[PDB]
Amino acid sequence: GFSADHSQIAQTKDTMFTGYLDPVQAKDYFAEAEKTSIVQRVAQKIPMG
Amino acid sequence: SADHSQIAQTKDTMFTGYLDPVQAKDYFAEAEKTSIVQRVAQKIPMGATGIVIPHWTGDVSAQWIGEGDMKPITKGNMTKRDVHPAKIATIFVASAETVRANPANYLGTMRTKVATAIAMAFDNAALHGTNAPSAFQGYLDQSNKTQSISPNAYQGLGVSGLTKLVTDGKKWTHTLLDDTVEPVLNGSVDANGRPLFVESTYESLTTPFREGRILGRPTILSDHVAEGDVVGYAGDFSQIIWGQVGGLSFDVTDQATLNLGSQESPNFVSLWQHNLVAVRVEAEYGLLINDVNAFVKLTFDPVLTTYALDLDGASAGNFTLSLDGKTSANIAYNASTATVKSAIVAIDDGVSADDVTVTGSAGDYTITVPGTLTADFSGLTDGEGASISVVSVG
Amino acid sequence: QSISPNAYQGLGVSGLTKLVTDGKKWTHTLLDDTVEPVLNGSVDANGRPLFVESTYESLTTPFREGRILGRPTILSDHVAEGDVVGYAGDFSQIIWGQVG
Amino acid sequence: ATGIVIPHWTGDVSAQWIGEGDMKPITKGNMTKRDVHPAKIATIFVASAE
Amino acid sequence: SIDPEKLRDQLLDAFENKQNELKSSKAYYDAERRPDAIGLAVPLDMRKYLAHVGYPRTYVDAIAERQELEGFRIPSANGEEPESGGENDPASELWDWWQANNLDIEATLGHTDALIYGTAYITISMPDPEVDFDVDPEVPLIRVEPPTALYAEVDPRTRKVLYAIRAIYGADGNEIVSATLYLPDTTMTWLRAEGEWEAPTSTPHGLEMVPVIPISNRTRLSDLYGTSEISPELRSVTDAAAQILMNMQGTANLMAIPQRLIFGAKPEELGINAETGQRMFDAYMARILAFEGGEGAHAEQFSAAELRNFVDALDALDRKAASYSGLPPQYLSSSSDNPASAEAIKAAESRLVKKVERKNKIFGGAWEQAMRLAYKMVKGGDIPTEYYRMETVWRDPSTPTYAAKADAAAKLFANGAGLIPRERGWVDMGYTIVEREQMRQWLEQDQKQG
Amino acid sequence: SIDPEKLRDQLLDAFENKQNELKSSKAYYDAERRPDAIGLAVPLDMRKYLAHVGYPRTYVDAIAERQELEGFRIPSANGEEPESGGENDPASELWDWWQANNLDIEATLGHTDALIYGTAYITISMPDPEVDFDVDPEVPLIRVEPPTALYAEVDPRTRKVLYAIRAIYGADGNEIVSATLYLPDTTMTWLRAEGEWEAPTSTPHGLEMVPVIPISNRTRLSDLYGTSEISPELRSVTDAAAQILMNMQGTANLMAIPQRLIFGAKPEELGINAETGQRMFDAYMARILAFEGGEGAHAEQFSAAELRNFVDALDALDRKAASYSGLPPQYLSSSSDNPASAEAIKAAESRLVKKVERKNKIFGGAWEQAMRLAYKMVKGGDIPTEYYRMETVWRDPSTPTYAAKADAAAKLFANGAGLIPRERGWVDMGYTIVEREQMRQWLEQDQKQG
Amino acid sequence: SIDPEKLRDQLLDAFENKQNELKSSKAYYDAERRPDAIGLAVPL
DSSP string of E113-166, one letter each residue: HHHHHSEEEEEEE---GGG--SS-TTS-EEEEE-TTTEEEEEPTTT--EEEEEE
Instruction: Indicate yes or no: CB of B51 within 8 angstroms of CB of A24.
Output: yes
Q: What dihedral do alpha carbons B254, B260, B266, B271 form, nearest 10°?
A: -10
Q: Report how far residue E28's alpha carbon sits from residue B188's, in angstroms, rounded to the nearest whole number.
A: 69
Interface residue C100 vs chain F (CB under 8 A): yes
Does residue B290 contact residue B240 with C-beta atoms inside 8 Å?
yes
Give me the phi and psi of E250, to 5 degrees please: -60, -45
Does residue B53 contact residue A26 with C-beta atoms inside 8 Å?
yes
Nearest to E17 among B108, B247, B251 (CB): B108
Give me the phi and psi of E69, to 5 degrees please: -70, 120
- Name the strand (E) or helix (H) holding E73: strand E69-73
Instruction: Indicate yes or no: CB of B21 within 8 angstroms of CB of F23.
Output: yes
Residue (of E347, E424, E406) closest to F403 by Cα position: E406
Nearest to E157 among F120, F178, F293 (CB): F178
Q: Which one-letter amino acid corresponds to residue E122? A: I
Q: Which residues of F touch G42 (CB under 8 A)?
A: 284-285
Instruction: Indicate yes or no: CB of B183 within 8 angstroms of CB of C50.
Output: no
Beta-carbon neighbour count of residue B179 at 10 Å? 17
Does residue E69 contact residue E107 with C-beta atoms inside 8 Å?
yes
**HSE of A38, CA atoms in CB hemisphere, 13 A:** 0
Instruction: Indicate yes or no: CB of E221 within 8 angstroms of CB of F136.
Output: no
Q: What is the resolution of this structure in A?
A: 3.5
Instruction: Indicate yes or no: CB of E256 within 8 angstroms of CB of G39.
Output: no
Q: Return the sign of the alpha-carbon dihedral for residues B115, B116, B117, B118.
A: positive
Beta-carbon neighbour count of residue B146 at 10 Å? 21
**HSE of E429, CA atoms in CB hemisphere, 13 A:** 21
Q: Which residues of B touch A29 (CB under 8 A)?
A: 42, 44, 53, 241, 290
Residue (of F17, F34, F15) closest to F25 by Cα position: F34
Residues after which chain A is broken (C–N above 2.5 A) are none
Sheet holding E259-263, edge to edge: E298-302, E259-263, F289-291
Q: Which residues of B214-225 are buried (b: 16+ CB within 10 A; e: fewer)?
A: beebebbbbebb
Beta-carbon neighbour count of residue F107 at 10 Å? 25
Q: Report how far residue F378's alpha carbon sits from residue F299's, in angstroms, rounded to the nearest whole number.
A: 89
Does residue F60 contact residue F111 with C-beta atoms inside 8 Å?
no
Instruction: Indicate yes or no: CB of F283 within 8 angstroms of CB of G42.
Output: no
Residue (of B168, B130, B143, B140) closest to B288 by Cα position: B140
DSSP-assigned beta bridge partners for residue F262:
F299
Q: Report how far residue F440's alpha carbon sits from residue F31's, in angstroms, rounded to the nearest whole number.
A: 48
Residue (of E319, E315, E249, E233) closest to E56 by Cα position: E233
> Residues in chain D, how many?
50
Q: Report how far residue C13's alpha carbon sits from residue B151's, in angstroms, rounded to the nearest whole number.
A: 12
DSSP annotation of F278 reads B
CA C78 from chain centre, in angstroms, equals 15
Residues 6+ apart with CB under 8 A from F448: none
DSSP annotation of F321 reads H
Q: In Å, how far is C30's CA from the nearest CA of chain F? A: 16
Q: In Å, how far is C93's CA from the nearest CA of chain B? A: 7
Residues 6+ apart with CB under 8 A from F318: E323, F241, F332, F333
The overall longest dimension of chain D from CA atoms, in Å, is 94
DSSP annotation of F367 reads H
Instruction: Indicate yes or no: CB of D4 within 8 angstroms of CB of C97.
Output: yes
> Residues in chain A, how many?
49
Q: Name the closest residue on chain F to residue B26, using Cα atoms.
A: F173
Q: Report how far residue F263's alpha carbon sits from residue E143's, in angstroms, rounded to the nearest whole number.
A: 72
Q: Which residues of D touch B9 (CB under 8 A)?
A: 28
Q: Report how far residue E17's alpha carbon sits from residue B108's, in angstroms, rounded to the nearest whole number.
A: 6
DSSP annotation of E171 reads S
Does residue B154 contact residue B206 with C-beta atoms inside 8 Å?
no
Q: CA-CA distances (angstroms) from residue F63 to B254, F102, F348, F360? A: 48, 21, 15, 10
Residues 6+ apart with CB under 8 A from E31: E52, E53, E54, E56, E57
Q: CA-CA distances (angstroms) from residue B259 to B270, B347, D26, E327? A: 9, 58, 9, 53
DSSP annotation of C60 reads P
Sheet holding B326-332, edge to edge: B326-332, B318-323, B373-376
Does residue E388 contact residue F104 with C-beta atoms inside 8 Å?
no
| Packed helices E103-117 and E4-29: angle between N→C axes, nearest 10 degrees | 80
Q: Report how far residue A37's alpha carbon sits from residue B388's, in angstroms, rounded to the nearest whole number.
A: 37
Q: Report how far residue E342's alpha carbon sits from residue F206's, in angstroms, rounded to the nearest whole number.
A: 56
Q: CA-CA distances (angstroms) from residue B210 to B171, B205, C50, E203? A: 23, 6, 21, 37
Does residue F181 contact residue F4 with C-beta atoms inside 8 Å?
yes
Q: CA-CA distances (angstroms) from residue B319 to B29, B143, B376, F406? A: 57, 22, 6, 116
Q: Which residues of C touch B182 (CB under 8 A)?
A: 16, 20
Beta-carbon neighbour count of residue B234 at 10 Å? 28
> Residues in chain G, how many?
44
| Packed helices E103-117 and E90-100: angle between N→C axes, nearest 10 degrees | 80
Instruction: Indicate yes or no: CB of A21 within 8 angstroms of CB of B48.
Output: yes
Q: Which one-letter amino acid corresponds to residue E270? A: L
Q: Report how far residue F247's alpha carbon sits from residue F253's, in angstroms, rounded to the nearest whole number.
A: 10
DSSP-assigned beta bridge partners for residue C81:
C84
Residue (of C73, C53, C52) closest to C62 by Cα position: C73
Interface residue B29 vs chain F (CB under 8 A): no
> Residues in chain E, how many?
450
- Provide the H-helix boundaries in F30-133: 55-64, 90-100, 103-116
Interface residue D20 vs chain A (CB under 8 A): yes
Residue (of F101, B76, B118, F50) closest to F93 by Cα position: F101
The phi-psi region of residue D32 (left if phi > 0; otherwise alpha if psi is between -120 and 50; otherwise beta) is beta
Give me the phi and psi of E8, to 5 degrees please: -55, -60
Q: Which residues of C touch B207 (CB under 8 A)?
A: none
Terminal-residue alpha carbon distance, chain C: 39
Rg (CA), chain B: 27
DSSP annotation of F130 reads G
**Beta strands at F150-154 and F161-167: parallel, antiparallel or unpaired:** antiparallel
DSSP-assigned beta bridge partners for residue E124:
E142
Does residue E306 contact residue F301 with C-beta atoms inside 8 Å?
no
Does residue F203 contact residue F180 with C-beta atoms inside 8 Å?
no
Query: In this complex, which chains have at least 3 CB pairs below 8 Å with chain C?
Result: B, D, F
Does residue B190 contact residue B213 with C-beta atoms inside 8 Å?
no
Residue (of B115, B46, B32) closest to B82 by Cα position: B46
DSSP annotation of B156 reads I
Q: Report how far residue B357's alpha carbon sits from residue B305's, in angstroms, rounded to the nearest whole number.
A: 11
| Packed helices E342-378 and E90-100: angle between N→C axes, nearest 10 degrees | 90
Interface residue B72 vs chain F (CB under 8 A): no
Q: Report how far residue E371's alpha carbon sits from residue E97's, in angstroms, rounded to the nearest whole number.
A: 9
Q: Which residues of D touch A12 (CB under 8 A)?
A: 20
Residue (of B197, B284, C56) closest to A12 by Cα position: B284
**HSE of A26, CA atoms in CB hemisphere, 13 A:** 22
Does residue F99 contact residue F107 with C-beta atoms inside 8 Å?
no
Q: Report how far residue F255's alpha carbon sits from residue E305's, in angstroms, rounded to the nearest whole number.
A: 11
Does residue B128 contact residue B143 with C-beta atoms inside 8 Å?
no
Q: Report how far residue E1's alpha carbon sits from residue D31's, in angstroms, rounded to the nearest whole number.
A: 33
To probe the interface with E, which of F134, F412, F420 has the most E CB atoms within 10 Å?
F134
Q: What dihedral do alpha carbons F2, F8, F14, F16 form, nearest 10°?
A: -170
Q: In Å, how far is A27's CA from the nearest CA of chain D? A: 28
Q: Which residues of C touch B200 (CB under 8 A)?
A: 53
The phi-psi region of residue E195 (left if phi > 0; otherwise alpha if psi is between -120 and 50; otherwise beta) is left
Q: In Å, how far is C98's CA from the nearest CA of chain F? A: 8
Residue (of F370, F352, F356) closest to F72 by Cα position: F370
Residue (of B151, B252, B146) closest to B196 by Cα position: B151
Rg (CA), chain G: 18
Instruction: Indicate yes or no: CB of C92 within 8 angstroms of CB of F13.
Output: no
Q: Report how far residue B122's alpha carbon sits from residue B114's, in angstroms, rounded to the nearest whole number.
A: 12
Beta-carbon neighbour count of residue B140 at 10 Å? 23
Does residue F47 contact residue F38 with C-beta atoms inside 8 Å?
yes
Does residue F59 contact residue F235 with C-beta atoms inside 8 Å?
no
Q: Which one-letter amino acid corresponds to residue E53? A: V
Q: In Å, how far is B101's CA from the nearest CA of chain F? A: 15
Instruction: Indicate yes or no: CB of A9 within 8 angstroms of CB of D21.
Output: yes
Method by which the model was determined: cryo-EM
Residue B238 class from Cβ within 10 Å (0-12 exposed, 13-18 middle, 19+ buried)? Answer: middle
Q: Name the closest residue on chain B to residue E15, using Cα atoms.
A: B108
Beta-carbon neighbour count of residue F185 at 10 Å? 12
Q: CA-CA distances (angstroms) from residue E99 to B3, E95, E105, E212, E367? A: 58, 6, 10, 20, 14
| Packed helices E4-29 and E55-64: angle between N→C axes, nearest 10 degrees | 110
Q: Name the closest residue on chain C to residue B198, using Cα atoms.
A: C69
Q: Report how far residue F71's alpha carbon sits from residue F91's, in angstroms, rounded to the nearest whole number.
A: 7
Q: Which one-letter amino acid corresponds to residue G11? A: L
Instruction: Indicate yes or no: CB of G43 within 8 angstroms of CB of F283.
Output: no
